[model samples]
Target: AMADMKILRTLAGYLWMRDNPEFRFRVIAALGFLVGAKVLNVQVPFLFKLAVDWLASAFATPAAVLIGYGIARTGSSAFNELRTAVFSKVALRTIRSVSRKVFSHLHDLDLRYHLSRETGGLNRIIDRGSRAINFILSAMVFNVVPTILEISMVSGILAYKFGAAFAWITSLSVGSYIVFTLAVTQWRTKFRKAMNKADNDASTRAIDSLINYETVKYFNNEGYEAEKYDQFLKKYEDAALQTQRSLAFLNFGQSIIFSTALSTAMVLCSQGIMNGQMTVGDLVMVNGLLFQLSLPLNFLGSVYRETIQSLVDMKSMFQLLEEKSDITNTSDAKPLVLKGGNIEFENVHFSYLPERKILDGISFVVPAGKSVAIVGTSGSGKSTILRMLFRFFDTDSGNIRIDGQDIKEVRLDSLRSSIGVVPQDTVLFNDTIFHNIHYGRLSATEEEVYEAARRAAIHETISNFPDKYSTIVGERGLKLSGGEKQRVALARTFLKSPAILLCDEATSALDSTTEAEILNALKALASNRTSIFIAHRLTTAMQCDEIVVLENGKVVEQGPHDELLGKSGRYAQLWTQQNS
Candidate 1:
């Protein structure tokens, strides 16, 4: 009973159903149909009982009762169908409302949360959660409620017509059936959980293998990847077999209990007929009622088990909703007002983990309408600088300011809107080049999109393709080359026309000729905005007004190309090595 109440509570937690304008009327109508169906169903058997008794009578024709029996049977089925049709709006709407909320919440969560979760497993969770909502709503409102009402009506009729023994047998049998079903279903829940885990494991492995197919082929490890996936499949197979075995055991036990109770009830009725205490019609009614009860009784076990499973799945999804974002805008946060786009990182300190420091006492400034370059080796915290500037992760200490206002005091959307980024490895949506570019600013005109692409040096390339800008980029823009992807990313950044630009090895994937062309274009674009360039190629840093060299998460050198080279410092050493 407690478990059943918890399921109801989970349903109530959605609240949107009650809040929806159409939900109340639909629910009331559906409940009416439900009661009407149950009443008609019970009447069908009583009409049959009357028709049998009339046929056995010595006087009067039985045609009227027989006709009424047919009408009652048909009406029962029609009412049940009406119940389903009326309730569908509520059920489907609830599923849509909850799924939308969960999806929006997933996007609102911190990037750090996404970085650690598996995509395939996350997809399964949402899918199961959405589907469970449908099952639970329909099962509880339609099947469970009607079944219980019909059982109560039949049990009361038995006690009223006959003696207390008949009612006692019916009640005791149902009670025992409920107890036994609950016990086994609880036991089976563990195996079902194991099966679900193994299923997710298999799906995750399969998706990973497919996504990394190029790497697998590069290493000649197709067979190895298949074997690894097969291992997960084997675990799933074992779990599935266990789940099936448990289900079969539960079904067999339920059948025995139901049949035993049914046989005893019929025996008592047969003895009553022989003792001249009941008519043949009375025995027929008893048989009809118990048999009707059997249909729902048999399904009761399934509904209970499925309800339990749905609750478990929904619980997992709800836990995700309960997760609070690590980053949030203050209630009084205002939109960023950019005038000159002067960016400053003041005494910044950050560490992803307490023990593994990634940045320490880092501070820099990009004066309005000027450019600064950051040069560092891999893992020298070069990329972390860009992430910090974007506020993907906040600094442990000190503040990031834009135009002399603390970024933390502004809305996240506004802060991000002012900055444009071209990452080292550009990822594009599986969409047309035109759409991908237009995504930067959804309100941009077609001519503007083409102009941005032209500035990014990809317009000519796109025009040469058969479909031109309409061509699909494929998954993560994998259809395009690395250089092409970078150019597309640049086009998006150009379309944004942000007040500040962040170039993180934006030219890394291009050839020397392409790099020079893009670098020139970038310089022209950054002429009016604050720009921060993080690069491994020293040549790219040479044209900057100033270069900051980062080593061991601290700035080791800061000056222009000539001044750093004259000093023969770390920047000069890297420049010499690259030139050589």
Candidate 2:
């Protein structure tokens, strides 16, 4: 009967219902219970009318009528509970699937987007999104659907028993109530949006402060951080108060409308009884159904408010899904066929922001099976060269090629699989050392993992530990010393055994002694393979077969270390500074 409305069609969560077959089945069974419950509920008042009329004349069996009323009432409530029992399963499954989908989607998004977000706030956004989706899904079927169904049934009965006037009055009151609520609720969106923003802001501030707990303590700014968090909370508190105040106004207006409707019906029915047109039994039935309808009606305000808030949150989450992946696999793209292990960056021009250039028309080449080191100070575009080879971001204008195949034309997975990248800082998952090493190749056997650790020179160290390979590395691998972390990274590369290696200042974080050890391990690993090293320390760069000096996003010099030193140029100047 309500099929003409856009309510169900525009329901945001309906997309989940379409593809989710199991959820649809459970919902169908739940809907059966819901309809059955309403049917039983509408007839309960009729049973009361029969009981009362029979008692007025004593011609009907009060025992049977009373028994009938009791049974109908019990059945009505029972079906509702049964519906909830079945629906809970549907709720849990949908929530999990939606959350997982968002999780995978976040990983697929561009690296730049990931870097743009605050980890703390991004997490809170997803947390609220999943929660709102579940609330809205449940609300549609349990609260909104049942209430509308009961209202129509009650109104239809009123018109049939009394007159069209009663039906018109019921419809008018409900219509006005909905219109007023929607108008005011729509007005309330800005406040709700403000409240949500403040909520996310407050949570991010607290989490960010706690995440950098060491910094706060080191700086002795605990009181300062607390005050900043309080500022965010104050804004949230103000917005929350306004929403509550708005709610009070809406509630008062609803009471005025519903009371008038109920009293007017009662007054009309009393006049009908006085005119010998209606019975006391009919009045009781009318009152009983109206009060029953009122139960769900009173909740209408909150249901609308919650649904609107959820839709806002749901929209925010869906926006994350809508972010188009910047690096897309082209139709002509194919698997990167490994032939000669050669890499070239030709006239690469790129930037994270348009106003600032990170790589400016830079060109370099690492011939097959040659180790070339790129030396530069911080922000001189050395690290970005490694990222370009890995295809983290598309260059603004240029091409990167591996073995004469333009990297952008080949399959991304195949391109990435053929090369291993060890970033400047190696942050491991807070898991077992075995798991971290095995992360490089999940299918690698336990012995292979041990061998890789041995090759990275951390094997005997692990063997001495109480838990050996199973030792847990604390948060971000901080439990391990600086040297140990670099070795673990090298271990992953050894396990990977790629044709090409791109290291982004892999040893910069370690002490000089550890740096020399890790550098030797890297050199051994680089033998007979194509390698491009981004090194901050000139000592590491001097050992490479060829050295490229980068300054202000441009390569100022390129050649063997001795050749550049003999020239007494930029490379020689940097070399002298590092030695001093």
Candidate 3:
């Protein structure tokens, strides 16, 4: 939209001013001042016309002259005030709106999308998007159009009075100036792409180093990292220098074209007057129009550059907005009623992608209030079973039912809200210790929040912090240790107290003592509630009331630990290794 309108004169002015009321007022004031400037500009030619017409009469000063000069000067000053006021307000508003939208979108995106994206690349896209919209609204719309109109109107008036020759010369010169600018800038597109690439490379390198700063320090590879950073810096430097050279060449070319056109017109006017083909007044009028044409040509070159960048920016922004959420509740999805969390998976066949089957012909039922553990080695599909229960992604061929109702047919929010999960990687938000635990259940009172934290063994740590529950943690809980972060996550999950608790190696990060403590907490919590655990160690698996052993995406054994130990099968083998 910006590119298509870039070359237009009046449309650009209206658009620029329309979005910015203050700037629009200033533009009107500027235009008014411009009219007076133009009139004065035209008066020079008229003065010459009158003086020439009255060569015999005594050269007299007209009283209208002093009044006109004063009015024009006052209007010009008023125009400047309008420009300053509008520029300040429009720029500020633009920056604020861009920041707000990008910030909101960052949070609105799904977790999986954020996990897969590069932090630096995302930031660059957002930063560019904000800058582009600002330029399009503030610079392209506000500045470009008003200047062009001034040029056109001045030239139009000159053409009306002085003849088509003057109009033709002025328009031709301005058009040539624009063509030269556009052609030169167009040729620099490769350099611009190279510059963007260099910027991305530098950003990527910096992010890599910062994210793995501890690894570099532990390995004493600071020198190596510095060398890598220097390499990226060199790429950026080369790109920036090349861009500068291109711009310099363009500026020089534009200047030459403008000067040549102005000089040619002057020489033609001098010849016209000397040969009795033109008057002194005609020379002044043509000169004024040429000057006005130069200003518009300058603005044309400017909008040409920023508007291109704005277009690129809009493309990146709109692309982000266009990302469709993969998991969305259907409009017709029915309400889910949780009655004792009796989950059943019937003939479940599933895969993350087509080439691999994570689950095959799997069918199971967890009777209400039963503690069940799924035991398997890596890539054995134990976790896939839990995912099927949670409905992260629907099965390829099967149905999951909770409380005798098909979960796919139920509302996703009600179904998911009934389940609480604590996975291997503990994610904590950047907030106070109190708010962090209460995040899972935002409506939980401080007393309820404290009780959950105490049960999760995180209350003591919160009390020790400088501001207790009010102490702020840095982004992603960087201020807390791994165990503390995990405990905080557990506390938050505990606050929810969902009927079905999915624990996937939830205690894997803790030491034996902490694991035992967490196990005790789970035992108390699971006594009256259904719980499913994906067990990584024999100690965890043995504690469950029922153990289901899986191999190659198929469950082969199901019994208590004692029953499985007697059989000397896969579970027995795993049991022996851990116990020994």
Candidate 4:
């Protein structure tokens, strides 16, 4: 019930009456059409009654009343079409606005929420909810509200014309029909809930399998994936059957109640004509009114059932809004200014979960205009340092500072723009090689791109290609090697020219010859700035000014390569182990 009000509030937000004058005009016009529709519609049956009365009384053609009834029916249908035409703008525009806001909301969630949820399932949740918006809104504006107005006009005529008997009989069936629909639907809603759950489960696993097609091949986990996925599909089959069968029972149940009501009311009206208490015209009008009223009762069941189902879909969509970003720039926050380019993580602590701590009191400093290499066991939390400096998440305690400014207090765009990272794997945006190179700096000229590409040692090879600079590199599949992809990333960074550079296993996957060539370029690239490398291989640290050994999320030791070797601690043990 409360969520229904929340939906109403969202209804009031987009395409609101007060904020949008154009929308208000459309809403009011549709409302006028509703009143007009009801007016002519009630008149249509009454006009038929007048025709019957005239012919029976005078034994005449009754040409005027008969022709007028035809026009009234035609006129009412015209008004309904006008309502549909005007209100369609309001309905479709609301869908667009709602979808736009939700799309932006997903972007803000960023790395925090997305990494936790299965992306495949979240997309479908948004898809199902967006489609739900149209039906629910149309039912509200076109069907439900219009029906309420119909009730008032209908009740007024029934009670006044033929005394309270007609009104009472009409009320009993409508009231009973609605009660049965709501009561039965209350029971049937769970079947839909079960079906949705199974549908989501089956589809997510299905999509996940498709995503990891090659990865599964490495370990041959195909049979395990198929076996489990089959169970989810089997579950969906059971739930879908339940939903369809219950729907049939509900439809048949409504048929029995309304059919009985219509027969009983029509019999009484015919009896009145027999006893000379009512005219033949009165019986004809009463029967017409009774038929018109009962059909819409079934539609009421349809809207109510689907409305609840839509609410279920939207519940997931709206829940995303409740996730507020913990890291945000305050009013006092300003852009970061670089000087010596010193970075320090002081008494820093973090955990991805409460029970499993990932980083416990990690502390380190990368001195001005220098290169530091970090190496440790696989789970020693090396790559997490680059993430924190980039401000992807907030550390639970302590601070990360660039020069003297706390990273948390800087504008997110300013902070992110000041740093550049070259990662283990590089991804493309499914465009040409030139377009990908140009993405590094949008305003960079053709000459500047060639210059940056040359400096990264990729221009000479690219110059000899089929499309030369415009060769397609995505979708049809990347025809380039790991070295070419890495250099492409470097071209973008050259355009960016960040103050700080981070490389996370940047050369680990490349061949020895390619790794040496890229490493030479990277060394030159970082010579004028503060840089950090998270290298799995100890040899990568041999030429660095300093080496930091990370263990259990803390900096266990830090010094020049020879100093660490002389001390013969964790770094010494690892070096000796690798040399053999």
Candidate 1 C-alpha lDDT tens digits along 181-279: 888878987887888888888888888888898898789767877787888889989988988888888889888987888788778767766655556
Evaluate residue 573 in candidate 3 and report its C-alpha lDDT on the 0 to 100 scale: 86
Ranking by TM-score: 1, 2, 4, 3
TM-score for candidate 1, please give it: 0.90
Candidate 3 on 30-144: residue-level lDDT in tens?
4565455545655555665675576656513544654555665666566556555654565566568657766787676665576567668777877776666656655644466
The list of candidate 1 runs beyond 4 A from truth reads 1-7, 13-20, 45-70, 161-172, 259-296
Which candidate achieves the best lDDT against the true structure?
Answer: 1
Q: Could you tell me the TM-score of candidate 4?
A: 0.87
- Model 4: ten consecutive residues of lowest lDDT: 58-67
Ranking by lDDT: 1, 2, 4, 3
Off by over 4 Å in 4: 17-20, 41-79, 161-170, 216-224, 263-288, 296-299, 475-480, 576-580
| Model 3 poorest 10 in a row by lDDT | 3-12
Best by TM-score: 1
Q: After superposition, how far is residue 41 of candidate 2 from its true place, in Å?
A: 3.3
Over the stretch 85-158, how does candidate 4's per-residue lDDT look in tens digits? Answer: 86777888888888888889888876776656774677787888889888777777667866665666666666
Writing each residue's lDDT as its tens digit, candidate 2 over 455-476 gives: 6778888888999788889998
lDDT of 3 at 1: 52
